[PDB]
Amino acid sequence: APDAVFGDRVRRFQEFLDTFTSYRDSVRSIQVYNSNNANILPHRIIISLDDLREFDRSFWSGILVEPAYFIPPAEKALTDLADSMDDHPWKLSFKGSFGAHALSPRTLTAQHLNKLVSVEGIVTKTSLVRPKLIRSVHYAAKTGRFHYRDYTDATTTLTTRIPTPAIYPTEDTEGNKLTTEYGYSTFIDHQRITVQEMPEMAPAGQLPRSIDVILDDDLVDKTKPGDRVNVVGVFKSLGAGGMNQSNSNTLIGFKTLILGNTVYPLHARSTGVAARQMLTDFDIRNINKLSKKKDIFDILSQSLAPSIYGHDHIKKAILLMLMGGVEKNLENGSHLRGDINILMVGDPSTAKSQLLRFVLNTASLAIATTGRGSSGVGLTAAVTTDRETGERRLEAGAMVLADRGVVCIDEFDKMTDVDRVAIHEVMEQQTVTIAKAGIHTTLNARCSVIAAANPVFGQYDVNRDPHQNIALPDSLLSRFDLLFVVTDDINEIRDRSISEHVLRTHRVTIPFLRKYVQYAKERVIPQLTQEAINVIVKNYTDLRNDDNTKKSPITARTLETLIRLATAHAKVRLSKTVNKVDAKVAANLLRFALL
Template sequence: MEEPIDAIDAVFGDRMRRFHEFLAEEEPTDYKELIREMLMKNENRLCVSIDEIREFDKGLWSGLLNEPSEYLPAFDRTLKDQAGSHFDPLNPAFRETDDPEFQVYHVAFKGAFGSHSVSPRTIRSTHLSKMISVEGIVTRASLVRPKILRSVHYAESTGRFHARDFNDQTTSFNPISTPPVYPTEDAEGNKLTTEYGYSIYKDHQTITVQEMPERAPAGQLPRSLEVVLGDDLVDSVKPGDRVQIVGVYRSLGGGANTSSSFFTVLVANSVYPLHARSTGVSARETITDSDIRNINSLSKNKDVFTIMAQSLAPSIYGHEYIKKAVLLMMLGGVEKNLENGSHLRGDINILMVGDPSTAKSQMLRFVLNTASLAIATTGKGSSGVGLTAAVTHDKETGERRLEAGAMVLADRGIVCIDEFDKMSDVDRVAIHEVMEQQTVTIAKAGIHTSLNARCSVIAAANPLYGQYDVHRDPHHNIGLPDSLLSRFDLLFIVTDDVNSPRDRSISEHILRTHRYVPTGYAEGEPIRETSTISLAVGNERLEKDAAEEEEEEQPMYQKYNPVLHAGVAAAQRTRGAKKPKILTIPFLRKYIQYAKSRIEPVLTQGAADHVVKIYTNLRNGQDTKSKRTAPITARTLETLIRLATAHAKVRLSKSVEVRDTKVAEEMLYSALFRNIGDQRPAKQAKVDKEVEDSDEDSEENSDDDEDIEADVRLDDDGDHLTAPPTGGRITRSQTRRVRQAGDSSQLQEPSQHEEADYEPVPQDETQESQETQQTQERMEQLTIQEPEIIGVPLSEQRTRPRGHENTISPDRLRTFNRIVSELLRDEQFQQDTGFTKESLFEAVNKKLPNEDLFSQQEFEAGVQKIVENGNIFVTDDGMMYGIH
């Protein structure tokens, strides 16, 4: 019997010697220094690269993967010996280190596991008793409990102590398990008393790792795997975390000798929380140097916001503002945690309410396929606890434990909720805390805890009556409480309006999509799913993925396909662009990831003042209260800040400027008033316009003092130059507008005092009247090219005397757009026979008091502008048709 024992000891000693030689190597990693750092930090787990073990000794590497129960004890024993040799109790650096003689040390592994990298779905019986790497998301976690390793007992009659070691398949690699029963008598029959203070225990916790939601095949339930954590690995993860776990896959038996079935677990050796690297490597793109160059070059494009927005769901026709809102949602604002404990969320929430068959669900589906982390659910198929968290009953221990819901699992991601209106009121109330505080607080069954649910919510719902009724107020159609609507930053109303040209375009696009066959597939063949499991684990994973992508540069733009990108073509025709630019989805993900993780814009004073002004105008606009789709509360102010910050991230800017707040204002007004136009009071809008012009002049002067021929857009609401304020000068920005709109050669050369922008100064009445007269004379010298008026030949327009051109001020144009938008939803102007220009002129003036009636010239200019924007279609015989 002595020879087999000596042979086994010799094999064990040989494995210890080979691993000792590996740790003694200083290249490529100095593990001696890592052992000293481990001791200084009073840790007991050393991370070793399995790739370096393969390079050092391939047999050692193969035995470790295929027979871990034979090699891991030798590795742990060698590490303990090395820790004892490096420990110096007299060294001050080791003053907090426990004596290695009484410590248990473990060797953890990282690197490429090759065919041993599996998921809960692909794990098989062939992996039993082997070391594997599993990737998933933690759904359940039990309480941390002590497990007995050695019990000590005292016999009073003899005065002697007795000890017993306990082994099972989760704490030891010994194939013989001891019964979990304390001894009550010694060999002589003397009664024993258990000494709990002298017994040795080990921390023990069980977690459930589920398959990644984005990797589960469509129509199949995600599979899960039980994982046992011990010692320092307990409490290293919580429900909702994405993790990579390296361990030994073992069977525990069925609990009865007559049962042929058994229970399998993964005994963890090392745990790598992926959420520590921004929602995980699995959902994180590897950004190369060429990608950073492309990202920086695209960010300098003045149309970067439009290019990225039209690259989102290019197959969906229209919905430009919704696509822009989705882009801003994926970027998000800046999250802030104040010293007083307050949490200011940076995630943006979006709600789409509209008629059926308006691509709401398709938009949600695209977010699922594009976002780095997104979880889909439906209103009817989700309960309140299913979205937040639930307290369940543990079958093994009989205890209560916490199970994470969809919003907790989507921490740092996006939750897509379809059919939001079908959810019951009781379940809907459960997400109120998540949408604002971004936490889930549970106080049930003796468990009181708070889980993080820092996620954005994008939801789609149908109106209260199935179809949106334009004759009712928005809150009568939506049917959701204001307490919930105020938590959504943007609420879009999507209606299915009858419009012959648009219906024809949409029908042709759908028919082209049904005839599309992907390259390499036969007609009707399902799309094959590609595996996305990486073979590397730990910190080396990012390095390997980056090295592979460096060899092949990823394209920035994708080739235009008229079948798949009809929505982009329609938007380009509206803007008059020639060739659509569509970013590839991988590059779009990288841009969003780069901007979201590295850019944290700071709000400037000018932007803050503009946000306050926008919020004040919205609160004071009592005449538009019934037309708003959502209530205006203090959360609306935070919405403006989040939208402006997200737009600054699009530009990769470190500061939020006034132009970002203007985009946020445009997005908010498009959602609140359904693109009706500017709903601000006329008097307040006029004052705001003057301030905006002054701010715009200051920005243009500071950005580009020398190049006054720069490409600057005209007024937001018109193509014509308006007169400056009384007593003002013609500023440089106004000079640019004139040069862009008409012939700049007829403009008089400004004096040296006119190089600076206009600043109002006190003047007496005589000087003010002279300044006004000079300004009017200078304005008369400007020749502005006017567009051709509908129904009036160009030759007849040229014969009109000066001073009677068809112009309209920006304030009057906003009022005109608002009235026409309301009229186009009236049944009188939605008939297939169309309407005349005269009937529209009469209907517009009926909406105004006598002192504010539009003149014929203003009406002609307003109609021309609406025709250019594509809201009204004019036939050759002069009939008009509204385009919604």
């Protein structure tokens, strides 16, 4: 029967929705979209705990400490408003500051039970998404009537209820047989996941702690194993901890878990979740303005790692790799590469690792590897495991995870042949092929590479040809688009200047660079122009038919490199076509790297 407290709380939350008028228009917009486009959006909105705090402290504290009594009223109020506005029940999500209620799996204890929490950690294992039967529909042949039944369980409501275990009907009330109508019944999706303490926060040498989270319906496949995640929900207990009946055993306790309602993926370094930033109109105006200047390439280049001295061409190359070219798919099924790769051979104090770590810190999706750090199955995802359902599966590796991203390799020359043959296919065909006992598949590995290497004799030697100084297979070098050699020669003026620079440090910002790169990579796709065609053809012919001794060989890969660099420079320019200047810049950079 009706309750007075429930109605009072419903009225108070309706007043709350009245004072703040963003959620009303959010609901209107969702309904408008669903009407016009028929894809269907789920019926849900997000509320800010901060606004609730300014509005009504008692209601705020009730939701924080007594969700089982205050949230269903709020959902009913929202549903009533939604049903009143328009010409499924609606659900709620929470954001803002949770104060002392923001915890981790290690610091979540029995004193937080029945309260709304927000946990952070790493996803370790998900489950198979299964349907759950809610309403069945049947048919009787002797009467021509349709019947139905409803089903419920303990996890579909926050408050405890008296069980009503109804049986599955096979007969009629008069004895006639029934027929199931699978198309007219109703099923809902269901999943269960596990969250652990983050590897970068848990104490060292200690076994970790984890907690289970249950999701339903429209939050069923929003994350994958290995992600950094933030889950907000209600920490709840179920059943009887061996209390009903005798149950002499006392070791077990009360089963506990989280009935989740909000899931947020978080970006970190060296992880599979990519960074994205919301772009406002001020940002777009500023970007489209800066696009019109003539030294834009120079400004964007000098911004990369401004604490390092010189290496301007390597900065330009890193920017070009960040932007990238365009990949082509022919109807027959052929694929043409569009990524850019960079290699660096240099002296042992040339700031190679600093630039490498800069790329790791500024790329939206990057993974850091070292020469002997990862090998075998750790790079190509060639490891196999299996579920407790019986099936065997694969799990992603370094380059499989970094699809559509970049990979940083340090101490490149310390690798072996077994993994170099593996990375050949990644660097050219951009695919990984696995053929083990019970598996035959092909995984996409479209990623770019930047690496740093050491000379054979510790320091680069000008008295010998490059082959004795690099000592790497020619077929491997052919797959690197650009190769740079850096040497430190003592010079009084250069040493002085670098000295004042290093002393200055010891006593365009990056976010705008990230926004610029994201917009450029998402919006513009240029096309080839005949002028650039002629320029690149001339340059390729000249390079292929010259007597100069180079740092790397010359093949058709060089021609494709020229096209890729030209297209990436045009992408930087925000132009929809490639001009002569982009081709000339690509040719100049390639010539400088080669000579």
